[PDB]
Each structure stands twice: as C-alpha cells, then as structure tokens.
UniProtKB/Swiss-Prot annotation, chain A:
Family of this protein: Belongs to the prefoldin subunit beta family.
Single Gene Ontology BP annotation: chaperone-mediated protein folding
Gene name per UniProt: PFDN1
CDD domains: Prefoldin_1 (cd23164)
GO molecular function: amyloid-beta binding; protein folding chaperone; unfolded protein binding
Keywords assigned by UniProt, alphabetized: Acetylation, Chaperone
InterPro entries, per database record: PFD_beta-like (IPR002777), Prefoldin (IPR009053)
Listed name of the protein: Prefoldin subunit 1
Originating species: Homo sapiens (Human)
A UniProt-annotated Pfam family: Prefoldin_2
PANTHER family in the record: PREFOLDIN SUBUNIT 1 (PTHR20903:SF1), PREFOLDIN SUBUNIT 1-RELATED (PTHR20903)
Signal sequence, start to end: none
GO cellular component: cytoplasm; prefoldin complex
Oligomeric form and interacting partners: Heterohexamer of two PFD-alpha type and four PFD-beta type subunits.
Swiss-Prot record, chain D:
Similarity comment: Belongs to the prefoldin subunit alpha family.
Gene, per the UniProt record: PFDN5
Keywords: Acetylation, Chaperone, Cytoplasm, Nucleus, Phosphoprotein
Annotated function: Binds specifically to cytosolic chaperonin (c-CPN) and transfers target proteins to it. Binds to nascent polypeptide chain and promotes folding in an environment in which there are many competing pathways for nonnative proteins. Represses the transcriptional activity of MYC.
Domain of life: Eukaryota
Bilayer-spanning residue ranges: none
Residues shown, of full length: 11 to 137 of 154
Protein species of origin: Homo sapiens (Human)
Name of this chain's protein: Prefoldin subunit 5
GO CC annotation, single: cytosol
Free-text tissue specificity from the UniProt record: Highly expressed in pancreas and skeletal muscle and moderately in other tissues.
Residues bearing the modification Phosphoserine: S46
Swiss-Prot record, chain G:
Tissue-specific expression: Ubiquitous.
Protein name per the record: Prefoldin subunit 3
Localization, UniProt: Cytoplasm; Nucleus
Keyword entries, A-Z: Acetylation, Chaperone, Cytoplasm, Nucleus
Organism of provenance: Homo sapiens (Human)
UniProtKB/Swiss-Prot annotation, chain H:
Protein name per UniProt: Prefoldin subunit 2
Molecular function in Gene Ontology: amyloid-beta binding; protein folding chaperone; unfolded protein binding
Signal peptide span: none
Gene name as annotated: PFDN2
Domain of life: Eukaryota
Location within or outside the cell: Nucleus; Cytoplasm; Mitochondrion
Length: 107, 114, 192, 127, 102, 104, 132, 103
C-alpha cells in the first residue's frame, strides 16, 4: 500500500525544510557575534558597553563580553552542524518511502 | 455575591466588565466572610449548598482562610437537631452571628479514622 | 479473458487477489519471492524503542535509530537474494528502502491468506522470527514470480513451489460467467 | 461529484490554515520563556549593581541600577504577577516552554492531514 | 446563507476569551502553586489596572482561588450564549436557503 | 463627480474621524476607575502602593494612585469632548450634503 | 462624454475617503509616541535621579526585577534602523517630540499622493476610454 | 476587435491603477529609513554613539554609527522599485490574461 508511502514523503518533506534557512544565519549570528565583539573591539575599551540577553542591557565589561560574545559566536557557530546533521538525514528519509513508492510501481 | 452565571456575577459581552464586577463580587464575599469572623466562629455549621441557594467558594475559600473550622454539606435537620441538643441557635444572618446563636462546643474535632 | 480450455494449473498458488497490477516486478524466475510478516517495525534501541522524532535532530537521530534495526532486518532479506519481496502488514518504510537500496522490491500491506497463498505459492513459510531470517524461511527452492496480464488484469504467479508442489486452479472464462459455471461444478470435483 | 468537492474544498484549506497559523505563533510565546530564563541567566551571572537599560517607552529606553537578581517575575494565573526566585522563575521560565510546546507541536501532524483531506478532495474534485 | 453564519460570530465572541481563560484557568492552578510556592521569597502581585498593586499571598490567595473560580465563570456566560447563538442559527439555516432557492 | 458627493464623502469621512478619538478614551478613563478599583480591591491602605510608569513603580500611599488615575480621566475626558462638538459641527454640514445632494 | 463624468464620479468620491484614512494614519503614530512623552516626562527628574522610583526592572516578558532603579539623568533612545544613542532627559525630551511629527507625516504623505491619484486616474482613464 | 482594445485599455489602466499600488507599497519602506536618520542626524551625535544590536549594545562613536544609515538607505531605495514594477508588470500581464476569458 502506497498510503503510508505517500504519508512519509509528506512529513519528512517539511521536516528537512528548516535546517536550510537557519544554518546560514547561524553562520551569520556566528560571524556577527564575532563582529559585535569586533564592534566593541572597535573602541579599544569602554564601560558603557552592553551585552544582554533581553530588553535589559546588563552593564558588562566588554572583556567578559568579548568572551561571552565570541561565546555567543560559538553558540551560533555550533548550531550550523546539528542542522546540517538534520539537513543530512532528513533529505534521505523522505525518499525512503519514495523509494518504496516507485519500486513497487516499477515492480 | 449575586449570581448571573456563577458566584461571580457575569454580564456577558466583553471580558473587562465581568472582570470589574468582580471588584463588586470579590469584595463582598470577602467582607461577608470578614463579617463572619467579626463576631467570630470556631465552627461554622453550613448546611448543604442545595439547602443553600449557593455558597461562594470565593467567600468559602477566604472564609476558611480567615481560619474558621466549618462543616458544610450538613442536613439542616442535623442543624435542627444541633440547634436544640447542643443549643446552637439558628443563624440566618450576621446579626444572628452572636455567641448565643453561635453554639459553644467543649471540643470540636474531625475523625477520619477508627 | 482466456477460456476454460487454456485454464490450467500453475504451481503453488497463482495470486490474483491483491494483484490488479504488478506490485512484484513483472517476471521473476530465480530471485526469491519473499514473505516479510509483521515484525518489520523499527526498534529505536537495541531491541528497544526510545522516544521518537520530535524536533530537529530527533528527526535525524531517532528516525535513524528506527532505520538501523530495520536495515539490520533488511539485510537478512537481501542476503537470501530476493528481487520481489511480499511483506504483509507490519512493514516499515525503513524495511522497504534498503530493500530499495538493494533494488529488491518490498511489497507492503497485503493480506494474510494472500501471503499464505504466497506461502503456498512458492510454498515458503511465514517468518516467525523476522530478526533472524533464512531463505529456508521465505523464498524457498528456486521459486518463481510471474505477473501476467491475461485479459484485463496483471496476475502474479508465484510458482515453482517447494512444499509438496502446490497447485491452484487457473480459472479463465471468456466472461466471468463462463468462468463461474465451470468453477461451481469444479467446486464439486475439488471437494470430491 | 466535482461541484460538491468544489464546495467542500473551501473549509479544508481553512482547517489547514487554522492549524498552520496556530502552531507557528506559540514559538513566539516560547521565545520569552527561554528569554526570561536567559534574561535571568545573565542576571544571576553578573551581579546586583550592574546598570540596566530597560525599556522606558517606544523610541526610548531608560537606564537603571540592578539591586535584585533573585527577584524575578513569572506570569501565571490570569492578569497576575508572581515575582519568583531566580531558580523558581527559571524553572517556570523553563517549564512554561514544556506545556506550551505540547499544545504547539501537536498541531503539525493535524496540519498535514487537513491538507491530506483537502488534497484528497482536490483529486476527487479534479477527478 | 448568512443565516447559517449569522449567530456564529456572536457565539465565538463569548467563546473567544473564555478560551483565553482556560489557559489562565490552568495557570490559575499554577498561580495557586506559585503562590503556595512563594512563601514571600519574592513579591506577589495581582496586576490589576495600569497601576501595579503591591499584593500579598493571602490577598492573592482567595483571589487566585477567586480568579480560578471566576476564570471558570466566564465559561458559563458563554455557556449561556453558547446554546443561544448556535441553536437559533440552527433554525435560520433552512429559512433563507429555500427562499433563495425558490 | 457631483460636488456635494465629494463633500458628502469628505464630510462622511470626517464624521467618523472625529468620534474616533472621542470613543477610544472612554475605557481608559473607565480603566482609570477600574485602576482605582483594583488597588481598592486588595491592599487598599494596608501596604506600600507603587504606581507603574514605564519600568519603575513609584512607592506611595493608596490615594496618590487614584488621584493620578482620576487625573488622567478628566484630561482624557476633555480629549473625548474636544471632538464631540466637532462631530456636532461636521454632520450638520453632512445632512446638508445629504439635503443638497438630492436637491442638486 | 458619459465616460468622463462617471469615471470622475466613481474615483473622486472613492478617493475622497482614501484621503481621510491616509490622514487617519497621519495621526496613527501620533498617540503611540505621544504616551512615550508622559512615561518620560513623569520619570524626568532633576535635583534627584531621573526616575528615582521603585521598580520591577523589565528584563523580559515573563520577567521583572525589584530594585531601587535610580540612574543618572539619561535616556537611551531608539531612533530605529539599528541606531541607539545615549541621551539625557532633554535630548530625550525633544528627540522624543520628533518621533511624533516625522512619524505623523510617514503615511500622511500617501494622502496627497492619493489626492492626485484621485485626479490622475480618471483623466488617464477617460482618454484611454477614448482609446477604448 | 474589442478584445484587444480592452487589453491595452487594461494594461495602461493597470499601469494607471498600479500608480496607486506602487504609491502605497514603497511608501513605508522609505518612511522608516528616514525617521531613523531624521531623528538620528538631527540630534547631537557628537559624543559616543551606540551600535544597537539586540543581544549586544555596542559602544561606538558617531563616525561609525552615523554613516551606516546613509548608504544602504539609498541602496535599498534603488532595489525596492523593481519588485513592484514586476508585480505591476505581472499585474499588467496577469490582468491581461484575465479580461480575455469570458467573451
């Protein structure tokens, strides 16, 4: 029966679609969280520098920020691959049932 | 407090009115209770809530939350038996909250056991 | 189509019932017609099943956990050299796609008597331990699988039966009536 | 055959978008859950006494001096404010993800089947 | 016909925030929790009106008990207009259907 | 296009325009009363009463809130009635743009 | 021509209302940033810290933090498009007055765009209706 | 005959009516870039100027924060005209196909 063969190709279809759009900004928000560090690295030192996780800008030493923000680089730096790991298998998984659709038809 | 669709009086169109009429409803059932603890009661005889028109949990919450031990859901004829045999005089009203109409028990406990 | 004249046995069981069209190749001679019987559903753990797909990497990791156990189940089928594989209910799309990776058609969600017909058609058994598989289990002998259009419908013939022969009555009427008149009296013989 | 499935196709596409629209928006409500947790993360991370630039009002923001880390809100009840403990609020900052994710994620397979119900009508509408 | 659809908006009207309640209803169980979970460790506020009202447990204790009860109360007001609106639009359905067919 | 009709629509335009900023201000004034009610609901006098403006909540007595709450009311209420006679003036020309439309 | 008047009849009144709503979004960004004035001007303070008051600091949506706020006299104003500066209470005052009017005239501008789009559509229509 | 006459009577009208479509479409795009620079470039930038990022409020000066609003504002204004002319040329072609159906 091709129903679940048509059912699996629909679900894993929209599964893989997310890993493509996110991975690049994850490289960006990697690169930008390097840049925003370089952006505060622009002015050699300041107390009025802020890094924050919310509407609050909690006053922080840009140094600990350079760590935190290259850490924030490292945050989005990692998420590219776990998507690419998502991006890797899900592309094949949708065709798993599709491989079952067509062979049985070629059969 | 007065009913429409619950102990909370609800006029039904948009939800701020029924939210504000709470200020009406909430304060009363609090004060009506505050009035219950004014004269004060250690036990409250409360007959069944169908031997009531209805009993505000909103009150009844803050009622027992002013720390008065209560029995609800009791037969009024129990109460009638209780109004006589222990001489707890019938209280239909807060003027009727009085140390005479509020019966004096030597000890009042609950046993879930034996 | 056909006529009771050219109506004549093929070995095992000639499979009309679920066949309106080939689901099993077209014509298969040596390659084994194979019965996969339930127990092709995944195990996300070793013998176990853990939490299933939810978000990003579970789609990867879990549906992979589902796949290995079945790929492990898959191999034992391909190891006995099938091409057509008739899997009754209890199939994974995981179970087919490596059968697809070996380009060995895995025929899913088809009835029991039909598979028992097919278990009588090549006369193979029905797999009682789908985790450890044998060609002695399913696809016995050399076997045959032949899906033939005779009149309207493609008709799977799984033949060259092991189990003591086996043979089913080929019923070809011109109409189904001139078919049926024979079969009803045929029904006397086959009972006698 | 065809016109009734021309008529019936109308609602199934909405049943698609009914489910399509809803599931997407609960991640937005989850954004604040990890946010406030993270806003409480770096809150406890640094100290009390850091300057806080907090929203004054649109086009503006106001500074401020943080004297409380462990003082942290949760929004539960109805219109209600529970200021919680740093770990308390985090726990609900955490946990409010958990229940909302359940109501959110359940919507996606139902999204498919409404289309699979619409797509089935599409065929029988075209066939 | 509009008669089919006529009272369904008035219907879902009273149903709209009633649904919103039922999450608040669920979180009213949670604020009962998070009040009981707050011994005063961090401030408890009924937020009512654009003014922040400094509040207490016992001030919010009956309240969240009253809220949850009240957050069950806007249920019944719809339950009032639930069978008002769905039932009369149930009669209207045949009224202008045939007339327009006529 | 017919002269009155352009004015009619432009006047029919303005009639709505003016009662717009009239009506939006009722419930806030009403909420300012509700806000007076909500502090009055619980913790009437019995504690600090902060009042919320921006991110800061100004600690004070009970009555200063309602005072500020009653304050914005009449202000906001004068804003209500500011366009009220402006609704009065606008539709009186519209009825003419109704009259002179069928008259011309 | 019968085509000129009605195409003038239709579009001009049609756009007469269109001239109102683009004036209604003239005033759309007016009260939004107008309330911002109050939130600032209340909290505007001299001789003490600007907004010296008590607060629950808004860190996030589900989150606040109790404290004594008091800052110096300053306000960090969002002007849009990834640009913030640190202003003091007055630059905060006046530059906030600006998000009133320059936002007021954002979609205000599309009104007089629709003023002549009221005018230009009929004229191009009727001449093209002659081409018709 | 009368089928082609309405087509150009449509397409110029589509261009004609589309004069309103591009009127409202690129408006707010222009509006936001300005208010920013209109509010920023007016008020004193002379001291330190924030680079504003959501998770990181960067400390910089005017020299850095000021020019960023000038350049891509003009760059975006160049690009925005295309999609509408596409949508209008699509509006030109699409509605050119639509009037052709029912004769």
């Amino acid at each position: 029966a091709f129903t679940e063969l048509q059912a699996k190709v629909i679900d894993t279809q929209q599964k893989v679609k997310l890993a493509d759009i996110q991975i690049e900004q994850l490289n960006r928000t990697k690169k930008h969280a390097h840049l925003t560090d370089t952006e505060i690295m622009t002015l050699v030192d300041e107390t009025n520098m802020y890094e924050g996780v919310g509407r609050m800008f909690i006053l922080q030493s840009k140094e600990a920020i350079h760590s935190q923000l290259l850490e924030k680089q490292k945050i989005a730096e990692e998420k590219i691959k776990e998507l690419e790991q998502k991006k890797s298998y899900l592309e094949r998984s949708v065709k798993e049932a599709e491989d079952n659709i067509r062979e049985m038809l070629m059969a | 407090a007065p009913k429409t669709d619950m102990d909370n009086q609800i006029v039904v169109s948009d939800y701020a009115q029924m939210d504000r009429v709470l200020r009406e409803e909430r304060a009363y059932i609090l004060n009506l209770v505050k009035q219950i603890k004014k004269t004060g009661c250690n036990v409250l005889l409360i007959q069944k809530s169908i031997l009531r028109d209805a009993l505000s949990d909103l009150a009844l919450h803050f009622l027992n939350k002013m720390k008065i031990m209560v029995i609800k859901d009791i037969e009024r004829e129990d109460i009638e038996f209780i109004c006589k045999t222990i001489g707890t005089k019938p209280v239909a009203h807060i003027d009727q909250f009085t140390a005479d109409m509020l019966g004096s028990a030597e000890l009042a406990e609950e046993v879930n056991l034996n | 189509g056909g006529i009771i004249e050219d109506s004549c046995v093929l070995r095992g069981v000639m499979i009309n019932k679920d066949v309106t069209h080939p689901r099993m190749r077209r014509y298969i001679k040596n390659p084994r017609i194979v019965l996969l019987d339930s127990s092709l559903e995944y195990k996300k753990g070793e013998s176990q099943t853990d939490i299933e797909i939810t978000r990003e990497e579970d789609f990867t990791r879990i549906l992979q956990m589902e796949e290995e156990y079945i790929q492990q189940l898959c191999e034992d089928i391909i190891q006995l050299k099938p091409d057509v594989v008739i899997t009754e209910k209890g199939i994974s799309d995981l179970a087919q796609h490596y059968l697809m990776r070996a380009n060995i058609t895995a025929i899913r969600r088809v009835r029991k008597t039909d598979n028992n017909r097919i278990a009588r058609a090549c006369g193979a058994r029905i797999v009682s331990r789908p985790e450890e598989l044998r060609e002695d289990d399913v696809g016995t002998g050399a076997g045959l699988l032949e899906i033939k259009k005779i009149g309207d419908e493609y008709f799977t013939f799984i033949t060259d039966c092991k189990d003591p022969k086996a043979c089913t009555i080929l019923l070809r009427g011109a109409s189904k009536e001139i078919l049926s008149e024979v079969e009803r009296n045929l029904q006397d013989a086959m009972q006698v | 055959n065809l016109p009734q499935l021309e008529m019936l196709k109308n609602q199934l596409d909405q049943e698609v978008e009914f489910l399509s629209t809803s599931i997407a928006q609960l991640k937005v409500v989850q954004t604040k859950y990890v946010e406030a947790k993270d806003c409480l993360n770096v809150l406890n991370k640094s100290n009390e006494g850091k300057e806080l630039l907090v929203p004054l009002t649109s086009s503006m923001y106001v500074p401020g001096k943080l004297h409380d880390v462990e003082h942290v809100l949760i929004d539960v009840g109805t219109g209600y404010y529970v200021e919680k403990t740093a770990e308390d609020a985090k726990d609900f900052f955490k946990r409010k993800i958990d229940f909302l994710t359940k109501q959110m994620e359940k919507i996606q397979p139902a999204l498919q089947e409404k289309h699979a119900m619409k797509q089935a009508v599409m065929e029988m509408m075209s066939q | 016909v509009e008669k089919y659809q006529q009272l369904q908006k008035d219907l879902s009207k009273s149903m709209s925030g009633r649904q919103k309640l039922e999450a608040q209803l669920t979180e009213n169980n949670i604020v009962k929790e998070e009040l009981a979970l707050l011994d005063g460790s961090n401030v408890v506020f009924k937020l009512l009106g654009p003014v922040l009202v400094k509040q207490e447990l016992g001030e919010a204790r009956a309240t969240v008990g009253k809220r949850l009860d009240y957050i069950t109360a806007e249920i019944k007001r719809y339950e009032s207009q639930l069978r008002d609106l769905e039932r009369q639009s149930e009669q209207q359905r045949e009224t202008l259907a045939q007339l327009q067919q006529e | 296009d017919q002269q009155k009709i352009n004015k009619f629509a432009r006047n029919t335009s303005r009639i709505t325009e003016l009662k717009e900023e009239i009506e939006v201000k009722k419930k806030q004034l009403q909420n300012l009363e509700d806000a007076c009610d909500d502090i009055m609901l619980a913790d009437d006098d019995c504690l600090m009463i902060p009042y919320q403006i921006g991110d800061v909540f100004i600690s004070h007595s009970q009555e200063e809130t309602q005072e500020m709450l009653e304050e914005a009311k009449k202000n906001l209420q004068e804003e209500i009635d500011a366009l009220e006679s402006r609704v009065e003036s606008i539709q009186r020309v519209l009825a003419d743009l109704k009259v002179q439309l069928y008259a011309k | 021509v019968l085509k000129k008047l009605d195409e003038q009849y239709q579009k001009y009144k049609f756009m007469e209302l269109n001239l109102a709503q683009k004036k209604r979004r003239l005033k759309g960004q007016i009260p939004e940033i107008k309330q911002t004035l109050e939130i600032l001007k209340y909290m505007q303070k001299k001789k003490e810290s600007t907004n010296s008051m008590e607060t629950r600091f808004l860190l996030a949506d589900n989150l606040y933090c109790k404290a004594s706020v008091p800052p110096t006299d300053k306000m960090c104003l969002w002007l849009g498009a990834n640009v913030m500066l640190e202003y003091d209470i007055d630059e905060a005052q006046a530059l906030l007055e600006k998000n009133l009017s320059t936002a007021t005239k954002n979609l205000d501008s599309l009104e007089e765009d629709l003023d002549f789009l009221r005018d230009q559509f009929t004229t191009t229509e009727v001449n093209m209706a002659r081409v018709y | 005959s009368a089928e082609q006459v309405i087509a150009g009577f449509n397409r110029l009208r589509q261009e004609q009516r589309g004069l309103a479509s591009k009127a409202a479409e690129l408006e707010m795009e222009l509006n936001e870039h300005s208010l920013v620079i209109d509010t920023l470039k007016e008020v004193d930038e002379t001291r330190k100027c924030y680079r504003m990022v959501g998770g990181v409020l960067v400390e910089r000066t005017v020299k850095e924060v000021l020019p960023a609003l000038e350049n891509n504002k003009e760059q975006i204004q160049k690009i925005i005209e295309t999609l509408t002319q596409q949508l209008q040329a699509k509006g030109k072609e699409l509605n050119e196909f639509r009037e052709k159906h029912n004769i």
